[PDB]
């Protein structure tokens with residue numbers, strides 16, 4: 001049920017369940033999580049893209065724009081057939097979507113971009129990339 | 143407070159005029175009524191005209207008095223920090239503790255400049271004077287802060303100011319980092335206002351820069367002694383413009399260029415480097431380079447001052463600070479021997495002694511900044527930076543007045559209505 | 569010399585002040601040295617103080633008279649052209665085909681803007697207001713064209729003067745293009761000042777642009793009609809900014825920001841909204857803004873003026889052109905005939921007759937412009953672009969008078985000296 005999942009789980013655990021079909025063990029979860037964390041940063045070139053939109057555009061149109069443009073930066077794995085292609089491709093989305101999501105807000109309000117932090121949690125890592133500045137140590141409220 | 147009763151004027155008819163008085167200063171004659179009576183005074187330069195009423199800063203040029211809201215500068219410099227002075231200068235009274243926190247915490251809250259604005263610096267050439275970049279970035283903030291450009295609204299002023307007050311140093315640092323080719327440095331919410339500057343001025347992403355409290359207090363003071371200076375060219379420009387509708391950012395960008403005009407003049411130019419060029423402990427000592435003095439541009443080099451007669455009050459704390467920091471920056475000073483020299487040549491020479499080219503507050507400020515490895519190009523910027531709190535004030539106080547705006551009259555002496563008939567056909 | 573022989577400032581000893589006389593208009597009382605005799609006037613408003621002596625433009629309010637270098641604005645705006653006019657204001661006389669042809673040469677051969685400044689345009693946001701961007705740019709001019717900034721070398725002054733004259737059109741049309749996402753257009757020597765500016769505003773690489781004969785003339789006329797308006801607030805900013813030494817461009821930027829000035833509030837353009845936002849006889853007026861206008865909501869659309877008493881000597885011809893213009897375009901006007909109805913209102917609506925809200929040139933210019941396919945956020949920009957030669961001529965004047973340094977006095981009504989004691993921290 002969703003209710004249980006919401007109160008008794010964290011987002012990633014749910015991605016796994018939603019993606020794999022069963023509750024993750026411990027060693028299996030680490031594999032899943034550690035990976036997601038491994039590829040959160042988006043290519044510098046991609047970043048130059050945000051910068052080609054006007055700050056005054058709806059951060060939602062920038063989202064459909066940056067995402068509908070990743071193909072041109074990940075030429076290789078665009079072949080739906082290959083089983084590992086899906087394998088990787090997904091993780092890329094799953095991993096980088098929040099990074100991209102945060103960035104749109106930082107572009108919209110005029111603040112600098114914030115790189116993912118490997119220590120924070122998935123969710124904490126978001127609020128981090130959403131609100132921190134290079135001016136004061138942002139602390140996430142659990 | 144005697145003949146302040148009233149007066150009268152008359153070439154063909156008499157008009158009863160009053161004689162106003164200040165809490166300090168001379169006696170003025172309210173001619174505010176003669177405009178109607180069809181009477182107009184002629185006074186280029188506002189040479190015998192009082193343009194306004196101010197409760198901000200008092201100067202007694204002939205007796206070396208400088209009060210900011212009544213508080214002498216000297217005390218303020220030694221007994222206060224820059225921000226506390228901005229508040230006093232902006233609010234009218236010493237800040238309590240809880241009130242100061244409010245003021246400070248805010249200033250700290252909005253120090254970062256919009257990323258888009260940043261892309262601007264990058265459109266200038268690195269080789270341009272960091273002072274032209276300052277008048278350029280500032281005269282361009284309007285396009286990034288469209289909303290609050292309406293001088294009327296009381297909160298508009300409210301915010302607008304804080305933006306300037308907060309971001310000017312950030313912008314100031316950046317210009318130096320752009321000029322020398324180093325990366326930009328974001329403000330740090332822990333450091334002090336002054337420390338935060340030296341931080342954004344010199345740190346790199348390669349080594350943890352530590353601020354020397356000594357060097358900081360000096361900047362702190364360099365700053366305070368520059369917060370504001372009563373009515374003058376740059377301040378008058380600011381007030382005028384503001385009165386002419388124009389937005390605060392433009393007003394500040396106009397003031398900033400007014401505080402750069404003397405620097406670039408030619409006779410001054412050939413004399414600015416003149417000093418900052420030849421100093422080989424053979425020249426200055428036997429008044430060699432000082433043997434040349436046609437194009438003076440002295441105050442531009444920290445000599446004398448239009449207002450003050452014998453000495454610039456703001457020059458004491460700085461002369462002492464100047465010494466201290468030199469003692470602090472230890473023995474690395476050699477060229478700055480001519481420093482020890484120039485003062486000696488300014489106090490012991492007739493000419494100077496007679497034309498009163500007395501080291502003003504900038505003579506020593508320059509020595510400090512130099513002692514700090516800061517290039518000359520950055521001098522007028524830091525001054526303009528510190529001076530902005532003053533410009534807001536006057537600007538603000540000019541609004542809160544009533545500002546029946548101002549359309550100065552001209553005494554036309556050109557041609558007399560004549561017919562036109564183009565002698566051309568192109 | 570009518571009802572004024574020799575006036576007497578009466579303190580306790582009779583002070584006779586010599587009355588000076590202008591060639592046109594009111595003569596004045598002298599008061600320059602008063603200060604040198606501890607006697608200062610008080611006039612926060614400069615409505616009775618004659619800032620300066622001039623010879624460029626003459627305006628007789630009541631009479632609705634405006635002359636440029638002696639010539640009636642009417643004749644100029646009909647038989648001359650912006651360039652000849654430009655030449656005139658700047659040189660005091662009408663050119664000879666040779667003076668005019670040489671002038672026209674020097675001008676067109678500098679209408680190109682440094683490409684680095686184009687890079688500067690892209691740094692600015694796409695949603696920025698033309699006027700705003702316009703300032704952002706002008707102000708940044710002193711950072712590139714750094715040789716024509718020697719404000720006191722007549723060799724460097726005419727340089728900038730010409731530069732500002734050649735480039736303003738180029739810049740303004742780049743403010744437009746930029747705001748609408750079309751590529752910037754290059755000057756065209758083989759074009760008249762107005763025809764080229766029309767071209768640069770509207771031409772597209774997709775095909776050659778055809779400059780309509782009537783539109784070309786109608787524009788020039790707008791240019792001519794805004795070239796100068798005597799000592800207003802903007803020229804007072806350009807005059808006051810320049811007195812402190814500020815480089816040419818710095819002042820012009822000020823005159824641009826200031827010009828924009830009285831227009832930035834929630835109901836400054838919010839009024840200038842249902843002017844173009846709505847185009848229909850019975851909607852905008854029809855029992856609408858009979859009370860829908862709130863703060864200024866008058867003096868912004870082109871109704872009334874603080875200089876002229878009954879009418880605008882410039883509106884006279886501007887109107888004559890709307891006719892020629894609306895007529896011409898045809899399929900670009902008849903809908904825009906909610907003017908006669910607006911115009912009409914002003915003429916007979918009591919609220920207007922009582923407020924002297926008569927239609928002015930900016931109204932007829934607004935119409936013509938709102939007709940050429942020019943947006944309202946580009947009206948002032950075009951009005952500033954033109955007022956530039958006016959600003960330029962004034963600044964070059966004040967610098968001939970010996971750079972009249974505007975350093976007024978103040979009336980101090982703040983605290984007398986009081987010791988400073990601070991118990992806080994931070």
Ligand SMILES: CC(C)(COP(=O)(O)OP(=O)(O)OC[C@H]1O[C@@H](n2cnc3c(N)ncnc32)[C@H](O)[C@@H]1OP(=O)(O)O)[C@@H](O)C(=O)NCCC(=O)NCCSCC(=O)O
Pocket residue numbers: 034035036037038039040041042043084087088089091092116118
């Ligand atoms: C296929 C991938 C491993 C690499 O694809 P990618 O799109 O180039 O990832 P990316 O562009 O974000 O990362 C490129 C580089 O940046 C590194 N990187 C990116 N973000 C981070 C980060 N937040 N912290 C540290 N390193 C990072 C990433 O580790 C790689 O460095 P290296 O090759 O030295 O390990 C990844 O997309 C993925 O999720 N793979 C899982 C699916 C799969 O079958 N992978 C095969 C190897 S098993 C992967 C694993 O267990 O980590």
Ligand SMILES: CC(C)(COP(=O)(O)OP(=O)(O)OC[C@H]1O[C@@H](n2cnc3c(N)ncnc32)[C@H](O)[C@@H]1OP(=O)(O)O)[C@@H](O)C(=O)NCCC(=O)NCCSCC(=O)O
Pocket residue numbers: 133135136247248249250251252253254255256297300301302304305329331
């Ligand atoms: C009106 C303002 C609050 C905001 O205007 P602004 O020009 O957008 O400031 P800004 O662009 O530098 O800041 C935009 C964002 O960056 C943040 N920011 C900027 N610099 C820093 C910094 N050094 N450290 C942390 N955050 C920063 C700023 O806090 C804001 O984030 P958020 O909305 O989440 O709090 C400010 O200009 C100001 O000084 N206001 C005081 C005047 C006033 O009447 N303010 C009304 C609210 S009371 C303000 C207060 O007490 O802080």
Ligand SMILES: CC(C)(COP(=O)(O)OP(=O)(O)OC[C@H]1O[C@@H](n2cnc3c(N)ncnc32)[C@H](O)[C@@H]1OP(=O)(O)O)[C@@H](O)C(=O)NCCC(=O)NCCSCC(=O)O
Pocket residue numbers: 673674675676677678679680681682713715716726727728730731755756757
């Ligand atoms: C110091 C100056 C010489 C240069 O200042 P600048 O701002 O760096 O140059 P600029 O931005 O005006 O660009 C003008 C240059 O591009 C050329 N140029 C600009 N627009 C055009 C155009 N539409 N078609 C052809 N050439 C053009 C122009 O001929 C000039 O070349 P040159 O080196 O021979 O003068 C300055 O005085 C100036 O060029 N014009 C100001 C007025 C003036 O006094 N000019 C000197 C006499 S020009 C004689 C003439 O060509 O009629």
